Design a protein around this ligand. Structure first.
Ligand SMILES: *[C@@H]1O[C@H](CO)[C@@H](O[C@@H]2O[C@H](CO)[C@@H](O[C@@H]3O[C@H](CO)[C@@H](O)[C@H](O)[C@@H]3O)[C@H](O)[C@H]2NC(C)=O)[C@H](O)[C@H]1NC(C)=O
Ligand SMILES: *[C@@H]1O[C@H](CO)[C@@H](O[C@@H]2O[C@H](CO)[C@@H](O)[C@H](O)[C@H]2NC(C)=O)[C@H](O)[C@H]1NC(C)=O
Ligand SMILES: *[C@@H]1O[C@H](CO)[C@@H](O[C@@H]2O[C@H](CO)[C@@H](O)[C@H](O)[C@H]2NC(C)=O)[C@H](O)[C@H]1NC(C)=O
Ligand SMILES: *[C@@H]1O[C@H](CO)[C@@H](O)[C@H](O)[C@H]1NC(C)=O
Ligand SMILES: *[C@@H]1O[C@H](CO)[C@@H](O)[C@H](O)[C@H]1NC(C)=O
Ligand SMILES: *[C@@H]1O[C@H](CO)[C@@H](O)[C@H](O)[C@H]1NC(C)=O
Ligand SMILES: *[C@@H]1O[C@H](CO)[C@@H](O)[C@H](O)[C@H]1NC(C)=O
Ligand SMILES: *[C@@H]1O[C@H](CO)[C@@H](O)[C@H](O)[C@H]1NC(C)=O
Ligand SMILES: *[C@H]1O[C@H](CO)[C@H](O)[C@H](O)[C@H]1NC(C)=O
Ligand SMILES: *[C@H]1O[C@H](CO)[C@H](O)[C@H](O)[C@H]1NC(C)=O
Ligand SMILES: *[C@H]1O[C@H](CO)[C@H](O)[C@H](O)[C@H]1NC(C)=O
Ligand SMILES: *[C@H]1O[C@H](CO)[C@H](O)[C@H](O)[C@H]1NC(C)=O
Ligand SMILES: *[C@H]1O[C@H](CO)[C@H](O)[C@H](O)[C@H]1NC(C)=O
Ligand SMILES: *[C@H]1O[C@H](CO)[C@H](O)[C@H](O)[C@H]1NC(C)=O
Ligand SMILES: *[C@H]1O[C@H](CO)[C@H](O)[C@H](O)[C@H]1NC(C)=O
Ligand SMILES: *[C@H]1O[C@H](CO)[C@H](O)[C@H](O)[C@H]1NC(C)=O
Ligand SMILES: [Ca+2]
Ligand SMILES: [Ca+2]
Ligand SMILES: [Ca+2]
Ligand SMILES: [Ca+2]
Ligand SMILES: [Ca+2]
Ligand SMILES: [Ca+2]
Ligand SMILES: [Ca+2]
Ligand SMILES: [Ca+2]
Ligand SMILES: [Ca+2]
Ligand SMILES: [Ca+2]
Ligand SMILES: [Ca+2]
Ligand SMILES: [Ca+2]
Ligand SMILES: [Ca+2]
Ligand SMILES: [Ca+2]
Ligand SMILES: [Ca+2]
Ligand SMILES: [Ca+2]
Ligand SMILES: [Ca+2]
Lengths: 5, 1337
């Protein structure tokens, strides 16, 4: 997933 | 040609005169240049110089084995030593005074009687040996023993030959000579010889003391511990970490990792002051250059080694490359080396490293069997380094060149966990974290270390405070700062041609080609990560930073940008939801805004208008802010998952990326209007955008197809770059010169490729943790001026912010709650449409800083507002402490609950450490877990592993060398017991690797085998595009897409040939470049009557239309909301043309601008211009007209009211050589009355035609000035003379020209008769050439 951790 | 020897032989010049005999005549070896080696070289016995890296590598380069002497850690003796006996089992040597004395004096105990061998101690065959000195009893019988300087010969025990006692370890503590008495000791100056072996400090120096950290406080005592004095006590839960001093100035320095500060103080405890508190976060250790007045500092939040002066002003980073985990540091300024330790690098190798005192010529001083090397101390008189190890648990010493490794202590019962160490004369004082005490140890060999001070906490670095610890030496930088411009950092005495120093520049500067004068930095690579924001030189040949790292205690940095005109960088912090600004040097940290920030994913800076854009991924919007005065507004509001945004100031465009399933890339005017997609086909996860300023090409990065593309700013002419190796998931992107810089989350690295094709992938950084955007700092880029920042006025005459617009225009804007007035430039209040809003809701406390915190976080003892504003004046009435915190009974102070009775006096009155339960009760941890004296419990398996698990040493007490570990624990042969979870784990945990050697790998169904069996990687990393195994066994044999075709589950675009997932086929969105994936064969989508079919095909409840949010993810459900109630000739002009009363349409930009264009004045009638308002890009006069903006401040009253020259500031012309006209125009004095007007001012005093008093005919005289404009330019619409004679109230108004001229109809211009009806149209409308006039060719 391309979500900022 | 070559050199011919005297014996008749040819030898090559390079091998002529190189200590090689060559020809037997030795012709090439009679001459001796053979100069002394430099700092980077090792000196062999014969004088040959070899590079430092060749030392102890396995090759006898010196031809004497001087560079391969004792690289092993003293595994065994070499024929033992004279008057000593050898134990067969482990190579330990003891003398006859212990052999057969009745006590087992070596680990095997073979030196006494044994029932398993029958050996007995007594006399024997030695009567036949007849030894040179004496006989004595051994278990084999009588054997030879010989005096000092007497060793037995080659396999001849009866014969003793003279021996060099100078080679024995510890024969003399400092120095030894063998010319007299078979040996003799001597001492360095300042020391005085005592007995015949020991050198002690002379009493001519004041005193000697040891300084060490108790783990909380800074202690000091004498060399025997009779009395101890607390020097400086730690405040605010501080922790003294690493200590060093400066005997000349009587100052003691110590670091603080808990307080993230570095202090210094006098030896008396006076004048305790902070040396550094910026960018220093975990200063593990410290060191002082006592002759150059420097302070070398270790940092571990951003692993680096710094140097700063004793007062803490001039700062510069020295070592950054591959520095891993720096722990220890030591230096010898007199000779000029820097020694530092490293217990793990970016490469897995741990090492003890040597370097010059300016970071040059790094060398692996000790590499084999180093484990976890810790602080380092130096023997300044014998030229040896001492380091301690926490993994293999030993104290070892090597020389300055790494040769002659000798072990002074070893074992889990001797030094279970050393941290720090220091030498004074003959004793190494070393901290140990397991016995929890500073221990005093002999520096040659020890059977058992003595306890010097037993602590209740883990102690830390130790130093010995004495003058002889800092020998005198000259200062190379003392000769007027060494000539360096900013900073002089000492180096090796042979470096810089013997000058002994190298010039440096503080942060924000770089050295010119002279290496003496600093110049302001122009370019460097700026990148962000979870832990820090860093700036790196582009040239990979060097590694050290140019800007101070930006770091905090909680830290997650994402977005960054820079302001070159102020040497300022911006950044965001998702752990604080704030946007900061900070200088390159690190000073002047300020916040920009901390209000209503929700996951700001990126930033960009409009360097000409000074506007800051950021993207709120939580608010789902983009915001602009003017830095001159805080003024913010949401310009785009209804996005789905916006990401990196980039703005083009000169072109007036901004670009933003969205990666919700219908992914796209948008473009808009800088105003935040005309939003439209430019790339919406064949996209997935478009993370990073970048702009090529040298070509106006937009570069963007995709992460779903693993591609990087580029196109013009219009989105046309789209091109892809080639395959980039090991790129699986790119986030950041930056284009600078001919390189493209990218950051991949899967790699956790910064890679560089060529900007025109796939390029030579070059890794810039590795192991950079969670990595975020990159940015190219460049001061040349931030150059230019639109009409928003043109001179002669400011900010484009707009209140608040003005936005550059494409085609060289500007549009004025104002913040939230403001509306543009009728003039379209200045803004008035608009509370009717946008009412004022609070900083926080009713359930949250607004801090003094713009942030917002929960209302029950007030006075909880923890700074949540990042301004302490929530913890201010707490404890008083109407300001009670939170229920979670603990309140001190007096003085009004609230402290966190976890600080209540934790053995630290936190409350100012000590209320937090008073009357709390001592009842450990009969409470017991499970029978599996061992119980410490602190009632903390750990498993039985953890006992006696030399690790202080209990935090009080209870699990390591009464540990003995009996070698009788528990059945579960594995036993290293002579090191320690160890847990099974460390046996065969890929890591050598024992000293000799006995726990890892001989085992095999073994893997579950969720793991994969490398082909060579070197590692057992997770199955997730199989076939991922990243080479994980060293032998590349994971990515080999992966499914290959058939040539031309695509995989089974992947649609193919017929017009392009690329592949997209079948889930994207017939979804309602054309992903293929020609829309081939939404062909007419797609089944149409249906929706239920109870739902609403959104424009993207979604079905949503019809109740939810206009409910407050776009549930469709498209504007469909919220776009259509009228639901809200109260609670003549036939021909015609075009769409964009104004219509006059008499026709002749005129373009709408000519409407109401003081130019009559309709003839009748319809385009300028007062009725027409009464309601007309200026376009947003045009300047509005005070009269109400709409002139183009480029007419503003151009010396010319084109507005009529002079409203557009009102307030213009004009540069003062040099009146000594130029002429300042009445309108403000600057013209040279030489151009005054030069022949034609140049000022064109209202005065028209420029062109008076001063010299001549008249002009001849043809070039006819003008009226009030004698300019020679011909009559052919009469009544032509412009004043050619500038003095009326062409407009001529006399001619062209009385009668039609002279007899030889004709007056045109449009313009009303008299033209020569040979122009009139000559066959060529000379009037504007051709009134001189009608069919009526006739005439012929
Ligand atoms: C390194 O060099 C410095 C400067 O030469 C040495 O410091 C100075 O050493 C002298 C002794 O040679 C000291 O003189 C003594 O001072 C005391 C106190 O006033 C006095 O009672 C004695 O009679 C004698 O005069 C001097 O004070 C001292 N300090 C300075 C700044 O001059 C230093 O000892 C040298 N260190 C080493 C390790 O060589
Ligand atoms: C994807 O982007 C293109 C532009 O590259 C859009 O095509 C434009 O569509 C509008 C109408 O919506 C036309 O007026 C323009 O002439 C089209 N091209 C230009 C020159 O912009 C296209 O509509 C976009 N598709 C989606 C699904 O948003
Ligand atoms: C809450 O209690 C505090 C402590 O008495 C009050 O703080 C004072 O507030 C006034 C007005 O802002 C300041 O002028 C004083 O300097 C503050 N401290 C002192 C010295 O009293 C605060 O006013 C109280 N608030 C309420 C609503 O009672
Ligand atoms: C024993 O010592 C003598 C000394 O000359 C030497 O010649 C001989 O080689 C040695 N033998 C062994 C086996 O060491
Ligand atoms: C650092 O120290 C200086 C001088 O005491 C002080 O002015 C500054 O506020 C300090 N900054 C921090 C973050 O403590
Ligand atoms: C580990 O070892 C055994 C053989 O010794 C093997 O059968 C088992 O499947 C392996 N299991 C794991 C945990 O990988
Ligand atoms: C103006 O001209 C004079 C004479 O050439 C020169 O000395 C002076 O520096 C100039 N000053 C400015 C402000 O241009
Ligand atoms: C200067 O401007 C005024 C209008 O403000 C005009 O009447 C006058 O004629 C101008 N001066 C000259 C020398 O033309
Ligand atoms: C030998 O050469 C080195 C440089 O290689 C230094 O100049 C050193 O000072 C020299 N030694 C002597 C004694 O002159
Ligand atoms: C209140 O919120 C609005 C947006 O809803 C604006 O950001 C406004 O500036 C805010 N007011 C204050 C005082 O911050
Ligand atoms: C006083 O203020 C604190 C602020 O966190 C809490 O609201 C608390 O409940 C208040 N009342 C008391 C009795 O402490
Ligand atoms: C200690 O506590 C554990 C956990 O509750 C068990 O109750 C155990 O039986 C107790 N031990 C003793 C000796 O009472
Ligand atoms: C050593 O001590 C342990 C303590 O648990 C056992 O008693 C063991 O039997 C002893 N002996 C050996 C050889 O391990
Ligand atoms: C890749 O390897 C597979 C192995 O089954 C097939 O041979 C396939 O045709 C190959 N394709 C390419 C392009 O090499
Ligand atoms: C649309 O109609 C089809 C049958 O033609 C199905 O009932 C389908 O489920 C309908 N759409 C939705 C969203 O229910
Ligand atoms: C002038 O201002 C009005 C609002 O007062 C409108 O924005 C109008 O569109 C503007 N004029 C033009 C030509 O756009
Ligand atoms: Ca030679
Ligand atoms: Ca070698
Ligand atoms: Ca004995
Ligand atoms: Ca990917
Ligand atoms: Ca709080
Ligand atoms: Ca406490
Ligand atoms: Ca250990
Ligand atoms: Ca343990
Ligand atoms: Ca292991
Ligand atoms: Ca892989
Ligand atoms: Ca599709
Ligand atoms: Ca809705
Ligand atoms: Ca007009
Ligand atoms: Ca003008
Ligand atoms: Ca002129
Ligand atoms: Ca004219
Ligand atoms: Ca004509």
């Amino acid at each position: 997933x391309n979500x900022x951790x | 040609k070559e050199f011919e020897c005297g014996s008749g032989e040819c030898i090559l010049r390079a091998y002529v005169c190189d200590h090689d005999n060559d020809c037997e005549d030795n012709s090439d070896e009679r001459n001796c240049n053979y100069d002394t080696c430099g700092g980077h070289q090792f000196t062999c016995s014969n004088g040959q110089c070899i590079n430092q890296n060749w030392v102890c590598d396995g090759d006898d380069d010196c031809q004497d084995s001087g560079d391969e002497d004792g690289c092993e850690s003293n595994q065994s003796h070499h024929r033992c030593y004279p008057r000593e006996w050898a134990c067969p089992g482990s190579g330990r040597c003891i003398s006859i005074d212990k052999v057969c004395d009745g006590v087992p004096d070596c680990p095997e105990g073979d030196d006494e009687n044994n029932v398993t061998s029958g050996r007995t101690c007594g006399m024997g065959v030695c009567s036949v040996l007849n030894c040179e000195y004496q006989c004595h009893q051994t278990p084999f019988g009588g054997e030879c023993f010989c005096p000092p300087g007497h060793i037995i010969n080659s396999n001849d025990s009866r014969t003793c030959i003279d021996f060099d006692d100078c080679q024995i370890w510890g024969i003399c503590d400092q120095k030894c000579e063998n010319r007299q008495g078979r040996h003799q000791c001597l001492c360095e100056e300042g020391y005085i010889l005592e007995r015949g072996q020991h050198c002690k400090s002379s009493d001519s120096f004041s005193a000697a003391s040891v300084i060490f950290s108790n783990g909380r406080d800074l202690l000091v005592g004498d060399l025997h511990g009779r009395n101890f004095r607390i020097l400086a006590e730690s405040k605010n839960r501080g922790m003294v970490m690493g200590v060093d001093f400066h005997y000349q100035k009587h100052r003691v320095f110590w670091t603080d990792p808990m307080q993230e500060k570095v202090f210094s103080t006098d030896i008396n405890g006076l004048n305790t002051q902070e040396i550094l508190n910026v960018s220093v976060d975990t200063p593990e250790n410290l060191a002082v250059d006592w002759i150059n007045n420097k302070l070398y500092l270790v940092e571990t939040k951003v692993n680096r080694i710094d140097v700063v002066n004793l007062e803490g002003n001039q700062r510069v980073t020295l070592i950054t490359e591959n520095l891993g985990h720096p722990r220890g540091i030591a230096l010898d300024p007199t000779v000029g080396y820097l020694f530092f330790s490293d217990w793990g690098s970016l490469s897995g190798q741990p090492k003890v490293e040597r370097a010059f005192m300016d970071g040059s010529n790094r060398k692996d001083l000790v590499t084999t069997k180093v484990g976890w090397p810790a602080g380092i101390t130096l023997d300044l008189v014998s030229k040896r380094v001492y380091w301690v190890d926490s993994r293999y648990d030993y104290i070892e010493t090597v020389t300055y060149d790494g040769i002659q490794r000798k072990t002074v202590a070893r074992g889990g019962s001797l030094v279970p966990h050393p941290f720090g160490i220091s030498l004074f004369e003959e004793h190494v004082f070393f901290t140990d974290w397991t016995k929890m005490a500073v221990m005093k140890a002999s520096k040659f060999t020890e059977t058992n270390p003595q306890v010097y001070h037993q602590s209740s906490l883990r102690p830390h670095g130790v130093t010995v405070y004495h003058a002889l610890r800092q020998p005198n030496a000259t200062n190379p930088c003392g000769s007027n700062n060494g000539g360096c411009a900013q900073v002089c950092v000492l180096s090796h005495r042979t470096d810089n041609g013997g000058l002994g120093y190298r010039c440096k520049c503080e942060f924000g500067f770089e050295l010119d080609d002279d290496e003496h004068r600093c110049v302001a930095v122009k370019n460097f690579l700026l990148f962000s990560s979870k832990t820090a924001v860093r700036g790196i030189p582009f040239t990979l040949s060097t590694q050290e930073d140019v800007m101070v790292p930006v770091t905090g205690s909680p830290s997650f940095f994402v977005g960054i940008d820079f302001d070159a005109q102020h040497s300022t960088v911006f950044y965001s912090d998702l752990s604080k939801d704030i946007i900061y600004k900070q200088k390159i040097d690190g000073t002047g940290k300020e916040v920009i805004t901390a209000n209503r920030l929700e996951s700001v994913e990126c930033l960009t800076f409009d360097w000409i208008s000074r506007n800051l854009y950021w993207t709120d991924g939580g608010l789902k919007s983009v915001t602009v802010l003017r830095l001159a005065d805080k003024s913010r507004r949401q310009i785009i509001s209804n996005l789905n998952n916006p990401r990196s945004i980039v703005v083009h100031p000169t072109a007036g465009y901004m670009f933003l990326s969205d990666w919700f399933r219908p992914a796209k890339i948008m473009r808009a005017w800088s105003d935040g209007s005309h939003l439209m997609p430019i790339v919406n086909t064949s996209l997935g996860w478009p993370n990073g955008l970048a702009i090529d300023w040298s070509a106006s090409r937009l570069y963007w990065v995709d992460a779903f197809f693993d591609k990087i593309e580029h196109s013009t700013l219009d989105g046309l002419d789209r091109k892809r770059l080639g395959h980039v190796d090991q790129m699986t998931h790119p986030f950041g992107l930056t284009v600078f010169k001919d390189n493209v810089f990218i950051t991949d989350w899967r790699l956790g690295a910064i890679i560089r490729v060529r900007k025109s094709d796939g390029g030579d992938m070059t890794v810039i950084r590795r192991g950079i943790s969670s990595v975020m955007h990159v940015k190219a700092y460049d001061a040349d880029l931030q150059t230019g001026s639109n009409y928003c920042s043109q001179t002669t006025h400011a900010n484009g005459d707009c209140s608040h912010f003005c936005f550059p617009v494409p085609n060289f225009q500007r549009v004025c804007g104002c913040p939230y709650g403001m509306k543009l007035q009728r003039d379209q430039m200045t803004c008035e209040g608009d509370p009717a449409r946008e009412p004022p809003t609070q900083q926080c809701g009713s359930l949250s406390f607004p801090c003094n800083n713009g942030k917002c915190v929960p209302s029950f976080f007030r006075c909880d003892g923890v700074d949540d507002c990042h301004d302490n504003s929530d913890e201010h004046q707490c404890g008083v009435f109407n300001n009670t402490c939170s229920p979670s915190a603990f309140a001190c009974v007096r003085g009004g102070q609230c402290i966190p609950g976890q600080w209540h009775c934790d053995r630290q006096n936190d409350c100012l009155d000590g209320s937090d450490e008073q009357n709390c339960p001592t009842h450990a009760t009969s409470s017991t941890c499970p029978s599996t877990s061992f119980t410490c004296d602190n009632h903390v419990c750990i498993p039985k398996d953890w006992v006696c592993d030399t690790d202080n698990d209990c935090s009080d040493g209870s699990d390591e007490k009464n540990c003995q060398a009996s070698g009788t570990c528990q059945p579960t624990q594995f036993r290293c042969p002579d090191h320690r017991c160890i847990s099974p979870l460390y046996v065969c784990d890929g890591d050598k945990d024992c000293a000799d690797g006995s726990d890892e050697a001989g085992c095999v790998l073994n893997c579950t169904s969720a793991q994969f085998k490398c082909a060579d069996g070197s590692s057992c990687i997770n199955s997730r990393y199989r076939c991922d595009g990243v080479y994980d195994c060293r032998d590349n066994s994971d990515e080999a044999g992966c499914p290959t897409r058939p040539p031309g075709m695509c995989h089974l589950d992947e649609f193919q675009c017929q017009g392009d040939g690329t592949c997209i997932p079948n889930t994207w086929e017939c979804d309602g969105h054309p992903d293929c470049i020609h829309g081939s994936d939404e062909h007419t064969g797609c089944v149409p989508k249906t929706c239920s009557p109870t739902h609403f079919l959104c424009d993207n095909g979604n079905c949503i409840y019809k109740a939810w239309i206009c409910d407050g949010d776009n549930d469709c993810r498209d504007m469909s459900d919220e776009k259509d909301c009228p639901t809200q109630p109260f609670h003549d000739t036939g021909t015609r002009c075009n769409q964009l043309q104004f219509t006059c009363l008499n026709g002749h349409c005129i373009n709408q930009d000519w409407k109401c601008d003081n130019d009559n264009d309709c003839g009748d004045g319809s385009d300028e009638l007062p009725t027409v211009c009464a309601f007309h308002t200026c376009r947003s890009t045009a300047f509005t006069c005070g009269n109400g007209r709409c002139v183009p903006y480029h007419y503003r401040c151009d010396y010319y009253n084109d507005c009529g009211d002079n409203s557009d020259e009102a307030g213009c500031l004009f540069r003062n012309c040099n009146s000594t050589t130029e002429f300042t006209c009445s309108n403000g125009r600057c013209i040279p004095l030489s151009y005054v009355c030069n022949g034609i007007n140049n000022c064109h001012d209202n005065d028209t005093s420029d062109e008076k035609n001063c010299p001549p008093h008249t002009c001849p005919p043809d070039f006819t005289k003008c009226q009030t000035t004698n300019i020679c404009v011909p009559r052919a330019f009469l009544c032509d619409g412009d004043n050619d003379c500038g003095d009326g004679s062409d407009e001529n109230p006399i001619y062209c108004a009385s009668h039609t020209c002279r007899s030889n001229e004709f007056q045109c109809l449009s313009p009303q211009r008299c033209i020569p008769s040979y122009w009139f009806c000559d066959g060529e149209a000379d009037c504007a409308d051709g009134s001189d050439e009608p069919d009526t006039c006739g005439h012929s060719v």
